């Protein structure tokens, strides 16, 4: 498909061709033996324009920044190809969290990276709003998107569409973005956008800046809390009463709260003025974590025909967080 355009950039960059030891993605050695991560986005191409707006600012960053990103080797934006240096022995944060290696310490380094990111010239950046949550989809899915989703996903969408309180809360959260101090924000954070080198022992890298914008810093804070929420109330569990699933889920969250607290301490170490500028940052972040729950449940529903009771319950925790961000902010330790 897109191999021509990828082999053409690698050739023009001196990286040879992709060896057989490796939209679509590619990682591994080049004929020249350089380890590269090839990303392709179908195209101009705005995700790559956002990626590049990050790589410009990341260049003006010390190797002592809590925020590290893989070096950009090149790009052909009109073909939707980017190439970066592969992180040696890359272990994603999703792998780490599944193995219990995403510890409090690593969560603090994530907050420092994210806190650092939000303090970094904002002139080259997209100020378009990120379609997350997708507000038009809360009214009506595009027919073509219905035909690319599972029955469980479709059911998960209808439940949110028919929940006026949630739909209203999401419209307000997105409305509030233009009334707050904006920051350079990743806007699509998940544990898998965090990479450690050296097979889990190395430094932390933040990647995937195709949604990088000048945006509400709550998006990233909420996203990180939301991942712990979803991990604690869903991932670790995937014939019981619903009250049991909520109880087991509430206790998993409580045991995972220090992960969120650590991130937020990290965050504030590197961005000590966040609340002096935004008192409602904790609350908006809580609301984003609440949406993030739905987002992650809907995505995982991809390979399901029904919504199991754990997903139904987990959803119910997000409605609580989104409809009660203030209290959720205190429960979550973002106060």
């Amino acid at each position: 498909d897109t191999v021509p355009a990828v082999n053409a950039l690698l050739l023009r960059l001196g990286l040879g061709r992709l060896d057989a030891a490796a939209n679509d993605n590619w990682a591994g050695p080049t004929t020249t033996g350089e380890q590269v991560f090839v990303k392709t986005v179908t195209p101009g191409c705005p995700e790559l324009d956002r990626s590049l707006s990050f790589e410009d600012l990341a260049a003006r960053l010390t190797p002592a920044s809590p925020l590290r990103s893989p070096g950009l080797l090149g790009a052909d934006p009109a073909a939707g190809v980017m190439v970066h240096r592969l992180v040696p022995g890359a272990r994603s944060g999703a792998e780490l969290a599944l193995d219990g290696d995403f510890d409090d310490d690593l969560c603090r380094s994530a907050g420092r990276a994210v806190g650092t990111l939000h303090g970094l010239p904002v002139d080259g950046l997209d100020t378009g709003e990120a379609p997350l949550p997708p507000l038009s989809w809360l009214k009506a899915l595009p027919w073509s998107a219905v035909q690319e989703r599972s029955m469980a996903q479709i059911a998960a969408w209808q439940l949110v569409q028919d929940d006026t309180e949630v739909v209203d809360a999401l419209h307000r959260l997105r409305d509030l973005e233009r009334t707050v101090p904006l920051a350079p924000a990743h806007c699509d954070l998940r544990f898998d956008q965090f990479i450690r080198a050296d097979e889990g022992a190395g430094e932390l890298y933040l990647v995937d800046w195709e949604e990088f914008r000048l945006a509400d810093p709550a998006r990233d804070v909420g996203a990180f809390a939301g991942e712990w929420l979803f991990h604690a109330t869903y991932s670790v569990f995937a014939g019981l009463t619903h009250e049991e699933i909520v109880a087991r889920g509430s206790a998993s969250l409580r045991r995972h709260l220090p992960r969120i607290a650590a991130f937020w301490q990290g965050y504030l170490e590197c961005r000590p003025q966040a609340l002096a500028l935004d008192a409602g940052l904790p609350e908006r972040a809580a609301a984003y974590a609440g949406w993030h729950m739905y987002d992650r449940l809907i995505a995982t529903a991809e390979s399901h025909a029904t919504l199991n009771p754990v997903a139904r319950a987990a959803a119910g925790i997000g409605r609580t967080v989104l409809l009660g961000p203030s209290a959720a902010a205190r429960t979550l330790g973002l106060s």
Partner: protein, 316 residues
């Protein structure tokens, strides 16, 4: 002596299959075809037992001895074999979106509010008042709807309250057999004027399977069922493997039929036919082990699940 003597009030095919099944007293161990299953409580055994009875009795995946991805080439062959292209679908109009590049209709379908191109409106012929019912030419092929499977709704709309659903299972031995069986079966069903949805495995690495093709016949199931059974009976044994589930009625080698569950109880819902029958058998077997008498525990639990224990392919 007889398998039916000892297991009275139960279909002989389920009597015979239960001879391969024992639960230890206390219900913390079970054996299904010498697949051993243990647990720390009766309740944990219920689901481990339910799963084994499912695999061993319904699916035919045996494991008591010494022994995913959509494929576009197959999706194309399966999608090519569909005679129709369109299923008229009713919803309520919410709003008419007047965009110059193409008007769109936000319509509350039964399963989701969707934004549909106005050019798909059939009835009425001009977009009604919001609140009014519309009817839409929506694609019949749904390749993502059911993970693992290519799914198609029939040309003819289904009953408003769908009602009883006759499931027909074809044990395709491979993808090539599936495409032939799929083509055959859709032909017959559309010729017989059937009200149906159907699906077929869309990963070639997942054959063979007894539910490799599944037909969901609504309304009057006998025309479609007769049509299907005549259109494939020629291939039964060759394109379909011969074995079928103990819970189903066999129509020909590797062609079985049943009904969607109609379980009275709230919370015991949204189960497939195979899992529903297996859960009720495990529950009756477990209950037995927590106290001929075994067959009564089993008949009782099936009956409480809405299953006809003489004919467990069907519901009371």
């Amino acid at each position: 002596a007889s398998p039916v003597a000892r297991h009275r009030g139960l279909a002989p095919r389920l009597a015979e299959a239960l001879d391969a099944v024992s639960v230890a007293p206390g219900a913390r161990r079970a054996s299904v075809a010498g697949r051993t299953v243990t647990a720390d409580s009766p309740r944990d055994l219920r689901g481990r037992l339910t799963n084994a009875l499912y695999e061993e009795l319904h699916a035919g995946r045996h494991r008591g001895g010494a022994v995913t991805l959509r494929d576009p080439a197959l999706e194309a062959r399966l999608a090519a074999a569909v005679p129709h292209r369109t299923t008229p679908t009713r919803g309520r109009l919410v709003e008419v979106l007047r965009r110059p590049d193409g008007d769109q209709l936000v319509v509350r379908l039964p399963e989701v509010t969707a934004r549909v191109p106005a050019d798909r409106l059939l009835s009425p012929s001009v977009p009604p008042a919001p609140g009014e019912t519309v009817e839409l030419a929506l694609e019949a092929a749904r390749p993502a709807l059911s993970p693992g499977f290519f799914y198609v709704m029939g040309s003819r709309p289904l009953p408003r309250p769908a009602g009883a659903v006759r499931r027909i299972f074809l044990h395709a031995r491979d993808a090539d057999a599936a495409v032939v069986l799929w083509g055959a079966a859709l032909g017959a069903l559309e010729e017989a004027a059937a009200l149906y949805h159907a699906k077929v495995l869309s990963d070639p690495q997942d054959f063979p399977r007894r539910d490799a093709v599944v037909l969901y016949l609504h309304g009057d199931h006998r025309p479609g069922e007769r049509a299907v059974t005549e259109a494939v009976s020629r291939y039964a044994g060759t394109l379909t493997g011969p074995d079928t589930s103990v819970f189903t009625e066999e129509l020909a080698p590797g062609v079985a039929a049943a009904w969607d569950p109609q379980d009275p109880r709230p919370g015991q819902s949204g189960m497939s036919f195979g899992q529903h029958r297996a859960f009720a058998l495990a529950s009756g077997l477990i209950d037995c082990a927590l106290a001929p008498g075994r067959a009564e525990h089993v008949v009782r639990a099936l009956r409480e699940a809405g299953i006809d224990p003489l004919h467990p392919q069907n519901n009371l």
